[PDB]
């Protein structure tokens, strides 16, 4: 499924070195368990700051490892939340975020189970 | 200090796209408290296994950062671990990887504001 990760397009974003282009796979996958507890309990304790900060992180993170729709939920989330709408008002984006994550880590953990030395 | 830290350095690691090598550096930064932590207490606990994990991980993300004395610190480390060298004798090792991910924090921090 080529709208949760996109190889070529995570090449491309890494300049065709296949060698960056894996090592970002690697820090993202590294750091998604830990985004994700952060956003979920966030949404729960309706938690402005954290849920911004993380999810600008993850933001970052997404215009280089070739995720396409956890590029454009993060890209709605952030917008909205800088522009002060409340967490309880973004929660379909925020779970359709938490449901991409999940495919997110399935798919990069099949990625480097397929190309990683 | 360019011991720690080297911008150019980054840049050749990745092949002279800025924005590639800033995104790299900040997913770097980001993961470095918890990084910290993770050798802290499987240093505390002689945890060679997760010691290893970690020193391993942080060693492959080093190698585009542009750090060079993290880089051969994690070399070091990561080598003897594998030579099943106990993580306690290596103590001496991990406090001096420890002092220098700070300065980095700082360096990439400071770089980052530029």
Redesign the interface.
């Known amino acids: 499924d080529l709208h949760t990760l996109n190889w070529d397009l995570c090449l491309t974003?890494?300049?065709h070195?296949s060698?960056?282009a894996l090592?970002?796979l690697?820090?993202?996958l590294?750091?998604l368990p830990?985004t994700v507890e952060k956003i979920q309990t966030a949404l729960g304790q309706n938690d402005q700051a954290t849920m911004l900060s993380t999810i600008h992180?993850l933001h970052?993170?997404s215009?280089?490892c070739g995720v396409p729709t956890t590029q454009r939920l993060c890209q709605e989330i952030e917008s909205a939340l800088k522009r002060q709408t409340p967490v309880e008002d973004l929660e379909p984006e925020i779970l359709e975020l938490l449901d991409e994550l999940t495919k997110v880590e399935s798919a990069v953990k099949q990625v480097l189970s397929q190309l990683s030395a």
């Open positions: 974003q890494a300049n070195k060698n960056l090592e970002m690697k820090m993202l590294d750091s830990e992180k970052g993170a215009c280089y």
